[PDB]
Enzyme design. Structure first.
Site, short mmCIF file in Angstrom:
data_model
loop_
_atom_site.label_atom_id
_atom_site.label_comp_id
_atom_site.label_asym_id
_atom_site.label_seq_id
_atom_site.Cartn_x
_atom_site.Cartn_y
_atom_site.Cartn_z
N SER B 164 0.81 -1.26 0.00
CA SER B 164 0.00 0.00 0.00
C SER B 164 0.85 1.33 0.00
O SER B 164 1.63 1.57 -0.94
CB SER B 164 -1.08 -0.07 1.10
N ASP B 261 -9.85 -4.05 -5.24
CA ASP B 261 -9.14 -2.97 -4.58
C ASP B 261 -9.21 -1.68 -5.41
O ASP B 261 -8.83 -1.69 -6.57
CB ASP B 261 -7.67 -3.38 -4.43
N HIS B 291 -8.13 -5.21 -0.79
CA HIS B 291 -6.92 -4.51 -0.35
C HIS B 291 -6.49 -5.04 1.03
O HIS B 291 -7.32 -5.41 1.85
CB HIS B 291 -7.22 -3.02 -0.25
#
Lengths: 318, 318
Positions: B164, B261, B291
């Site tokens: 991320s 995501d 995610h």
């Protein structure tokens, strides 16, 4: 970062390359001391060659009243018993274009649909700003519905159609009519060639667009700055159509993407959104194409095909 | 609108649902109205469960110096003859996370790679702003290279790795090293799980992201506002990495996307860009995943797989 772009001019189809390689000796260069008037002039003169040889048919011009004043419209009548009326909203980044630049597209669309097509010469930006154009278009369409018999047209069923900024206007107008719950005709269809619908960035926007099509992100930002009155309009449901309700009562949408167009993801997202909510729609990618290909119908089968497809999609809802 | 999103919880894989349906009765409710400190605390406590049963190995902790002060690092050494050193940068939207929330990821990475993994406890935002963390990472990395022999690590070759926000940091860091043309070790590979790279919008951003992941576009705007110091930083080639030169001398990148995501398109664009310019890279989409899936390796084989793959990609470059 121009370097990071896909090498477009190498990957487009043969027919798209023929158009790209077409020279018009008698033209000036794309204005550097770019007065918007000169850019307009240039776009108008340059489009002329691509509009030549358009279908003969009965045409008329009428002034329609709006809150902002009279708007010229142009009516193309392929035959006397039309089953519906289709409004055409021309592209041009909100600042360029007019009814002559898109004459051949509109006439081809009447020929193939056998419906009355009515082009609307909406007020260009930056003289006008959002939502003036949409309001003019909704005014034109609501006027013709209430006065349908005067003009001898069939306003029980209507459509909206447009290219690029035109496509945005087309869908913004249909959503505007739905939302304010008028019956200015049953919106049977909306035809949307390579539109932008309010994405601020996308895979296609980063990977594509350059001097070859003037759709760099700097270009798009300038067109947006000329159109919008307020920064907040960026989030309006009649500019960023993805902020509107796209989950019910959306008219059937014909969504046509150009392959090597940075705006392609706007089309894809519009489609995936409508399809995920069971809204009637068709998506078609036209391979080998750049943005704006609709104008090249005389030389490009794929351009004429896009026209035929939209026409067919529309008449199929009637 | 939120209504315009496709229904994610319905569409994901069976094993992702087992994770989604797991209750932790002990922890509080999600403090959206709470302090940043209460958010960090929550994230730490909640993530603890998913870090149980981590590989046991030789571990060390070292304070490394930087222009912003000492930065804590943690070193997981699976074997005494490591061929390379891999720096892991945790995610958490720049404002959350630490070395404990990603302890299991880092230790599995070391085990699967048989390389020393060094985690860097970069200063979180909003206390730190861009480019502080990147500078701390670069500094820590250059320090270990210059002091390789004292810590008994191999810095002749290095990787950066992250999830991320961490993936952004991993790649920013590598590009920062490249652009300086500095030698702090040959960057053999960058491992990138479900990163964001500076897109402001995308198809997947519009279509995905809700309470289920905390990746609404409102959430994303909030983390960016905590991270950046000046609005112009939005265009920095070390924030919007797509504004950097991605056509020449990019280390090999392993790019893992998660199917449902909103950030998926960021990974797609990065892959497409690198692949169009013949930059060494590999893309893999992990189906049925939300995610953040990398933390769930003791309940999802997909999570474990994504770890093995990046690990294997890294070792293959050595």
């Amino acid at each position: 970062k121009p370097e990071n772009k896909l090498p477009v001019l190498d990957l487009i189809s043969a027919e798209m390359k023929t158009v790209v390689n077409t020279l018009q000796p008698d033209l000036p260069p794309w204005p550097a001391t770019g007065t918007i008037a000169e850019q307009r002039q240039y776009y108008t003169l340059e489009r002329r060659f691509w509009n030549a040889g358009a279908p003969e048919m009965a045409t008329r011009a009428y002034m329609v009243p709006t809150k902002y004043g009279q708007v010229e419209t142009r009516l193309f009548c392929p035959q006397p018993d039309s089953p519906a009326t289709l409004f055409y909203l021309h592209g041009g980044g909100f600042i360029l274009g007019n009814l002559d630049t898109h004459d051949r597209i509109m006439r081809l669309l009447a020929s193939y649909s056998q419906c009355t097509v009515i082009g609307i010469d909406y007020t260009l930006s930056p003289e006008a700003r959002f939502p003036q154009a949409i309001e003019e278009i909704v005014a034109a369409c609501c006027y013709f519905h209430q006065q349908a018999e005067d003009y001898q047209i069939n306003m029980s069923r209507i459509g909206f159609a447009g290219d690029s900024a035109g496509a945005m206007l087309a869908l913004a107008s249909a959503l505007w009519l739905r939302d304010k719950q008028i019956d200015c005709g049953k919106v049977a269809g909306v035809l949307l060639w390579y539109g932008l619908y309010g994405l601020r960035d996308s895979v296609t926007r980063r990977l594509l667009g350059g001097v070859w099509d003037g759709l760099t992100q700097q270009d798009l930002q300038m067109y947006e700055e000329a159109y919008l009155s307020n920064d907040a309009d960026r989030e309006s449901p009649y500019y960023c159509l993805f902020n509107n309700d796209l989950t019910r009562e959306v008219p059937p949408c014909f969504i046509a993407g150009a392959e090597f167009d940075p705006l392609l993801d706007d089309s894809r997202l519009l489609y995936q959104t409508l399809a995920a909510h069971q809204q009637p729609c068709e998506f078609k990618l036209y391979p080998g194409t750049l943005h704006a290909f609709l104008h090249y119908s005389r030389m490009m089968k794929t351009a004429d095909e896009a026209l035929r497809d939209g026409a067919q999609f529309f008449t199929a809802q009637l």
